[PDB]
Design a binder for this molecule. Structure first.
Ligand SMILES: *CC(=O)[C@@H](CCSC)NC(=O)[C@@H](C)NC(=O)[C@@H](NC(=O)OCc1ccccc1)C(C)C
Ligand SMILES: *CC(=O)[C@H](CCSC)NC(=O)[C@H](C)NC(=O)[C@H](NC(=O)OCc1ccccc1)C(C)C
Ligand SMILES: [Zn+2]
Ligand SMILES: [Zn+2]
Lengths: 139, 139
């Protein structure tokens, strides 16, 4: 679902870490260095995470309730500074292009021609960052 | 190294969660149910985790400072008892075979013919449990 702030492939859920409030489960994986939690759920999704290397993409902006086309660049690591909630740490496997960003936009799906490749994790003045989900998925 | 109590593949290191949870928020992956944690490091490792099948293997026992041949049984889960920390919990993605094990033996590598497939996580009456690192890796 285009407006869904999470990624759902099969029985798996890919979701921002701080967007988690729910129950502890056996299948829960957590990447503190990527603000990502992965777990299994009872329902099934139609999302698909490709094993590609695309950069010509598009993503969902929540506070505008619309999709922006975007060209992104892959970063091995990047200094993600400190906001009120969490400190200035290092986040691995990021995607970055220019685009609008405002609080409450995390989970916004980023897609290429093959499927969902990431979700909004942070942004700044006219630049937005995504978790590269391709790294946390098997071909 | 054969006596190294950790798996070190590429820029990633694999350790027991219940022993290295101090720097947890800086880790790149965590599985609370399987007692696994993964950190990044500058150095590059020689270790190799295969995507295979083997049940006939060998593992490093620190308190005897030598290797034991061992035949392991893949459990999807099993519940360990209570020591002087972490009361009787359940653990998932395990390998278990016959072999000596006393406190301080974890990280002891479990190798097959192809490479490393686990580290010691639990030990009891002539039985030692490993984490199935193959369940946490991509071919
Ligand atoms: C879900 C939520 O509320 C968002 C808010 C998005 S609005 C920006 N979560 C966040 O963690 C926000 C507060 N994070 C940040 O603003 C980053 N800022 C940042 O450096 O990103 C800009 C950037 C541009 C290009 C490459 C990398 C980053 C801070 C945590 C530093
Ligand atoms: C993994 C380690 O080496 C450390 C030593 C810490 S020393 C302060 N871990 C443990 O001691 C670990 C948490 N406890 C156990 O492994 C043992 N668990 C148990 O009773 O089950 C034994 C067993 C289970 C399944 C298969 C085979 C054996 C006890 C609690 C010491
Ligand atoms: Zn693609
Ligand atoms: Zn093998």
């Amino acid at each position: 679902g285009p407006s869904d702030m999470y990624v759902h492939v099969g029985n798996l859920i890919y979701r921002n870490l701080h967007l988690f409030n729910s129950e502890m489960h056996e299948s829960i994986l957590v990447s503190y260095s990527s603000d990502l939690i992965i777990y299994r759920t009872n329902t099934v999704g139609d999302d698909y995470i490709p094993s590609c290397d695309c950069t010509q993409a598009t993503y969902y902006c929540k506070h505008k309730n619309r999709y922006f086309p975007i060209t992104v660049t892959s970063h091995d690591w990047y200094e993600i500074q400190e906001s009120e909630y969490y400190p200035k740490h290092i986040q691995y496997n990021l995607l970055i292009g220019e685009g609008p960003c405002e609080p409450g936009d995390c989970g916004g799906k980023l897609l290429c021609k093959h499927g969902v490749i990431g979700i909004v994790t942070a942004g700044g003045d006219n630049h937005v960052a995504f978790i590269d989900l391709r790294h946390f998925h098997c071909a």
